[PDB]
Design a protein around this nucleic acid. Structure first.
Lengths: 60, 195, 50, 52, 61, 175, 158
RNA sequence: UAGAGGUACUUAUUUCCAAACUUCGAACCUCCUUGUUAGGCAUUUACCUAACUGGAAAUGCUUAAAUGAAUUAGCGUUACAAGUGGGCUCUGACCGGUAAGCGGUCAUGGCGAAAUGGGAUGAACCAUACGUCUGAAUAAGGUGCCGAAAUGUACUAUCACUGAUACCAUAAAGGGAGUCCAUGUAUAUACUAGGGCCCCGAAAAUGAAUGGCGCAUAUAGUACUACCGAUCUCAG
């Protein structure tokens, strides 16, 4: 209704941004830069096809 | 004599000018870069005609003097040293080197003595110009067609929109002249900045 | 005869297997420092306990 | 499963508004308004030789 | 395929390497207590009986 | 397949200037997520508006008023080939603007051999039969169009009923 | 021809910016230091007595000695494997009071301002903390300038 | 480089440059801080200050209020000893060289010590790094037959003793009323801005290799589903 109110007025309802995400590891382990597997070890995504929920802020 | 210029086409070092350090250098093949009616004007010879290079590579000094002589001798034949103005907008500063070889000590103390001058081009660098009148625009294009076969790679011949060698379009040139902002130096256009 | 002079290919690898932070015992270094300062710092401590 | 039936209806009720004849012609009129003016001439260089 | 560091940096001595009856026996007494009573005192006495003869230094009178 | 999209975006409010100009871009992409990225490419390239400081307000999906009937579509585009950029006005006959744009990406990749990375469209619009000037598409706007179907297909009427033998020989004549 | 000199490969380190040649102002000599203070070493190229090495340019440390013209600074160089400590002596004209802690010390005093003043009214406290830049709340936007960006036809312009 | 203005120089310009030029100056990096912080009180000093109910420093007492980024994680310390001290290399950056499967460096990765699948074949490239088995669905890569899997659907080009999938196993400058698409003008027609594909340019020695057979809608591009396929992933 907040969306359909703004269209009838004139404006745009821009929505709220996503507060968290869900991060599948697609590719496996090897042939990989050490900064870029330090970062995956911090999300606990070590094996291929693993996932957790991650909160979205300018750190993450 | 010389190497084939397929040796010294692509750029595999930092640029290496004539200086204190280089020392034993032979002078380039070019002396004159500019021929025809040099003492002319922006208004007298408005039409211009450029030769643009479509590669990142080295151009030799021997190519640039071959291109001048073939340009002059066509424009001399047709119209006869009046209208035209030829200019060359590369200057060869890069010095080449050779290991010589000619018993022998090859690849040991490999650094070599300078052989010849060269010019380092950049993708869309103009390497020649002909400024002229509308009567001999036809003759300018046929000159730069012949001069293009001198140079390595491939290279487009282009009629420019802008006046003379000045950076001003024909539409802009009348507005500034009328405004009175621009002024005339002996050759080319000198702007007036009102300061 | 002519073999390689050096390399740094896998210096980084070895260093990171273990860049241990060597911690200092105390901030004062009494071998250095002004003697005239440390001379007086003795007579502060010696006078206090009596 | 009661709630996700209601949310399925409300999200489907928006697609009634989206695919209505009234709303679609407004969005197509916005898309026709958005497009630029017709170019007279193609080609990389126009080339002008005005005297002086 | 998992990214872990598989190596062990730290072993620790769990039971005593003596082949006595009596040292092995009263280890199990204070091991039994250290578990069951859940106390810091008996946990230390249990572990002191594990450790080698060099570290058990002779405490003079 | 491609769907026409209208995307409107703007820069964030600074304290110097709250309520800036927003900007819209017509884009062609398979879904809403790709249509954002095409908007940020065009907005950055031209109007100097980056992803890292800007909102994106409304991804509107343009559906057709009627897909029931056929329309002519002029497509003004530039496409880039090594050593030069060319401007071309090409046109097509189709049910929708998207299906015309999907046609020309195949036709440029076919005829000229350039991908959708190099191509950059200027203008799509529907066009009347009077203003239409290209001969091969003008013939379909006339009355009394006959062409035969020379070269029939041999396919299975359903994929169950295919076979790799036959007693009689198939006839592939138009008739 | 690699050389291991004292002042080697420092053409542009000990250069003096641009229109900042000459001796420094005498306000610099009037400044004071203490033990425990965080200080950054950056060099005057002019003043040659009691420089640091080239390596400890732009390098934060802690003061441990103070002496008539000069300050003993403890600085953590990274050796090969491990981060060694290094006891420098260096003059005060290459040494400035660093603003590393001034973010932290601002917050502690700002917290005590909040923690006391909550009790003064009292009332009841909300707890402030630092937080990375976060995704935005929903809200509604009316503009009244909407341009329509398109790609133009390409023209050479030479 | 090349003209103009002044009394060969010189004042403004202009064509075009520097690893051992700099008046500006990124990206990528680097280093420090982020829990205890503000005080107040009175002993000690041969030190500092003109002076002590000051400074400087360390000893204790204590007045307030809290655990004050994200994500992750147990951290610290010692002893004894093996092998090693010929390396090679993909992708980028670089020095020398006409160049090299050449010589010498740099950053991450790989091989060496890493199987299996894919690139017909290959230490190094792609997917992935492995207990013994039984399935499912995939990755790289493929689906005329050899060969497991659509000669799949939709849309554009192509006739040539020719073309055919990264690293990769070679081809350029320069031409063509071959064909398709095409820009601007003039009067169905003349003049061309060009672009692909195809042809020419294009010659070596045993008989010869898109992997072979062969194909010509099994060739060149584009889009979207289904399907086969590793010791990966998942289930037992």
């Amino acid at each position: 209704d907040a969306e359909n109110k703004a269209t009838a007025e004139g404006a745009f309802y821009v929505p709220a941004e996503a507060k968290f995400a869900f991060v599948i590891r697609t590719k496996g382990t090897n042939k990989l830069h050490p900064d870029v597997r330090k970062i995956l070890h911090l999300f606990r995504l070590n094996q291929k096809h693993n996932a957790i929920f991650v909160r979205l802020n300018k750190a993450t | 004599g010389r190497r084939p210029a397929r040796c010294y086409r692509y750029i595999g070092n930092k640029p290496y000018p004539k200086s204190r350090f280089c020392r034993g250098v032979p002078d380039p093949r070019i002396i004159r870069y500019e021929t025809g009616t040099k003492t002319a004007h922006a208004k007298e010879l408005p039409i211009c005609c450029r030769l643009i290079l479509l590669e990142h590579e080295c151009v030799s000094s021997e190519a640039l003097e071959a291109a001048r002589v073939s340009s002059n001798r066509y424009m001399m034949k047709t119209m006869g040293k009046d209208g035209y103005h030829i200019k060359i907008n590369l200057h060869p500063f890069h010095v080449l080197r050779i290991n010589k070889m000619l018993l022998q000590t090859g690849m040991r103390h490999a650094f070599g003595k300078p052989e010849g001058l060269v010019a380092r081009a950049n993708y869309n660098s103009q390497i020649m110009t002909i400024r002229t009148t509308s009567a001999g625009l036809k003759h300018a294009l046929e000159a730069l067609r012949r001069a293009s076969f001198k140079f390595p790679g491939h290279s487009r011949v282009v009629i420019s929109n802008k006046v003379g060698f000045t950076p001003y379009t024909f539409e802009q040139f009348k507005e500034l002249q009328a405004n009175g902002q621009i002024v005339d130096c002996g050759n080319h256009v000198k702007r007036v900045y009102r300061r | 005869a002519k073999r390689s002079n050096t390399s740094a290919h896998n210096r980084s690898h070895q260093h990171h297997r273990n860049i241990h932070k060597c911690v200092v015992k105390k901030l004062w270094f009494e071998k250095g420092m002004n003697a005239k300062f440390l001379r007086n710092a003795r007579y502060a401590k010696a006078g206090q306990n009596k | 499963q009661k709630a996700l039936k209601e949310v399925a209806e409300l999200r489907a009720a928006q697609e009634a508004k989206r695919t209505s004849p009234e709303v679609v012609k407004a969005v197509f009129a916005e898309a026709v308004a958005a497009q630029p003016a017709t170019p007279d001439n193609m080609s990389t260089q126009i080339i002008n030789h005005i005297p002086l | 395929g998992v990214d872990l560091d598989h190596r062990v940096p730290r072993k620790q001595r769990q039971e005593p390497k003596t082949a006595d009856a009596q040292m092995k026996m009263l280890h199990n007494l204070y091991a039994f207590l250290a578990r069951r009573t859940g106390n810091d005192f008996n946990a230390k006495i249990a572990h002191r009986l594990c450790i080698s003869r060099t570290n058990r230094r002779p405490y003079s009178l | 397949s491609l769907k026409q999209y209208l995307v409107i975006g703007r820069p964030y409010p600074t304290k110097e200037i709250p309520n800036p100009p927003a900007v819209r871009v017509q884009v062609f992409a398979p879904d809403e997520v790709i249509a954002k990225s095409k908007f940020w490419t065009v907005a950055q390239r031209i109007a100097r508006l980056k992803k890292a400081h800007g909102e994106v307000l409304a991804v509107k999906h343009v559906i057709e008023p009627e897909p029931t009937r056929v329309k002519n579509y002029g497509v003004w585009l530039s496409y880039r080939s090594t050593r030069n950029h060319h401007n071309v006005y090409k046109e097509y006959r189709d049910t929708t603007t998207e299906g015309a744009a999907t046609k020309m990406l195949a036709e440029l990749a076919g005829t000229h051999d350039v991908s959708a990375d190099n191509i950059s469209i200027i203008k799509i619009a529907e066009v009347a039969d009077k203003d239409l000037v290209h001969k091969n598409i003008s013939q379909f706007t006339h009355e009394n169009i006959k062409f035969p179907m020379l070269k029939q297909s041999i396919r299975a009427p359903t994929a169950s009923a295919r076979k790799v033998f036959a007693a009689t020989r198939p006839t592939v004549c138009g008739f | 021809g690699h050389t291991e000199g004292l002042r080697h490969a420092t053409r542009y380190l000990f250069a003096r910016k641009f229109r900042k040649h000459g001796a420094p102002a005498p306000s610099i000599t009037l400044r004071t230091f203490r033990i425990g203070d965080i200080v950054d070493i950056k060099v005057n190229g002019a003043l040659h007595s009691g420089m640091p090495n080239r390596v400890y340019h732009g390098a934060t440390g802690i003061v441990w000695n103070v002496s008539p013209h000069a300050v003993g600074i403890l600085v953590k160089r990274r050796v090969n494997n491990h981060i060694a400590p290094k006891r420098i002596y260096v003059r005060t004209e290459h040494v400035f009071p660093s603003k590393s802690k001034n973010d932290f010390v601002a917050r502690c005093q700002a917290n005590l301002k909040a923690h006391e003043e909550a009790k003064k009214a009292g009332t009841k406290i909300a707890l402030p903390k630092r937080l990375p830049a976060q995704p935005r709340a929903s809200h509604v936007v009316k503009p009244e300038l909407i341009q329509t960006i398109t790609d133009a036809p390409f023209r050479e312009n030479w």
